[PDB]
Amino acid sequence: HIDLSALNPELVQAVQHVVIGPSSLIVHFNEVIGRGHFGCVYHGTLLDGKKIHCAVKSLNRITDIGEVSQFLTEGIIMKDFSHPNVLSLLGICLRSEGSPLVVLPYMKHGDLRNFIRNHNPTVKDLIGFGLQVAKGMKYLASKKFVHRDLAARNCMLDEKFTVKVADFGLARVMYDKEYYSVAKLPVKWMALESLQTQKFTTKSDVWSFGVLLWELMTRGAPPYPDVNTFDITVYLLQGRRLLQPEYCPDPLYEVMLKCWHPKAEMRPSFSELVSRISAIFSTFIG
């Protein structure tokens, strides 16, 4: 029962250009994919009559203008992302009654963190996943887009094992709650300057990317498990970094240390990371 007239008109216009008519979408409400504090994800079918399997993102409540606007804004930020390693938007379904729905292509293997924690990807496969993230990030950084929450939990994996960089945003699943701490920030993925200023850049996405490579090489271990969330800045400032994983090649560990350079301006670009990781990947048989 949303009132579009009370929302930002430029936002509503943007939503209308990617609109999905309520009749083209079948939402299977009994087929829940995920549940969170602010939103839920269901299986869906989008209709030449060809059926497209999709994921349908909804808000739990439609009473707050700020939450509704943020929800639509999240969907709109995605509309022009067109890259094999970035999650795309199928459209937004505005209904007469209930939450607007953000429609995403269905990702067979779910999120990358759950995938690597579950299958037996080789070390080359895991490095390949990192290279795919770096390509998706090289594309976003070229559009001057700052992610702010790069982590394996925000990367999706389709049926061809193609990694799609994404952000659950308001559809954040309840199991992910421990990784965010008081605004709720993903402190164990954040760069030192961002922990101190709460300001984000492509260079702070690079720090997060190094943490994501560590997640990959450990097959989804939680980073800094013995550090209290509010003490991470003190821990890092003692002169510490995540340790080299057993199956992490030395050149890949060196790349991680470069991603965590204390000076943001000295961290490698995503363009350099794609180049460096392509080379390391190529050394493995498969």
Ligand X SMILES: COc1cc2c(Oc3ccc(NC(=O)C4(C(=O)Nc5ccc(F)cc5)CC4)cc3F)ccnc2cc1OCCCN1CCOCC1
Contacts of 251 (CB under 8 A, 6+ apart): 276, 280
- Subset of residues 88 to 127 that bind ligand X, contact rule: CB under 6 A: 102, 104, 106-107, 109-110, 114
DSSP code of residue 38: S
Active site residue 149: yes
Residue (101 or 248) nearer to ligand X, CB: 101
Among 168, 189, 207, 260, binds ligand X (CB under 6 A): 168
Give bridge partners of residue 185 from the DSSP assignment.
181
The verdict on 165 binding ligand X (CB under 6 A) reads yes
We find the least distance from the C-beta atom of residue 52 to ligand X, in angstroms, to be: 12
Q: Which amino acid is at 207?
A: W
Q: Is 36 annotated as a binding residue?
A: yes
Collapse the DSSP code of 199 into the 3-class scheme (helix H, G, I; strand E, B; otherwise coil) and give the result.
coil
Residue 35 counted as an annotated binding residue? yes
Closest listed residue to residue 268, CA positions, set 246, 250, 284, 252: 252
Q: With CB under 6 A, what is the number of residues at the site for ligand X?
A: 28
Residue from 2, 20, 62, 74 touching ligand X (CB under 6 A): that is 74
* Packed helices 270-282 and 250-259: angle between N→C axes, nearest 10 degrees: 170
Distance CA 63, CA 239 (A): 47
Cβ pair 236, 229 in contact under 8 A = no
Q: Which of 2, 167, 185, 210 binds ligand X (CB under 6 A)?
A: 167
Instruction: Work out which of 15, 18, 27, 81 binds ligand X, going by CB under 6 A.
Output: 81
Question: Using the rule CB under 6 A, is 55 a contact of ligand X?
Answer: yes
CA distance 249 to 272: 18
Partners of 41 in the β-ladder = 34, 57
Choosing from 149, 167, 176, 250, the catalytic residue is 149
33 carries a ligand binding annotation: yes
Least distance between ligand X and beta carbon 229 (Å): 23
Structure tokens at 143: 């559009």
List, by residue number, the catalytic residues: 149
Task: Detail the residues annotated as belonging to a binding site for ATP.
Answer: 33-41, 57
Residues that bind ligand X (CB under 6 A): 33-34, 41, 55, 57, 74-75, 78, 81, 86-87, 102, 104, 106-107, 109-110, 114, 140, 147, 156, 165-169, 171, 173
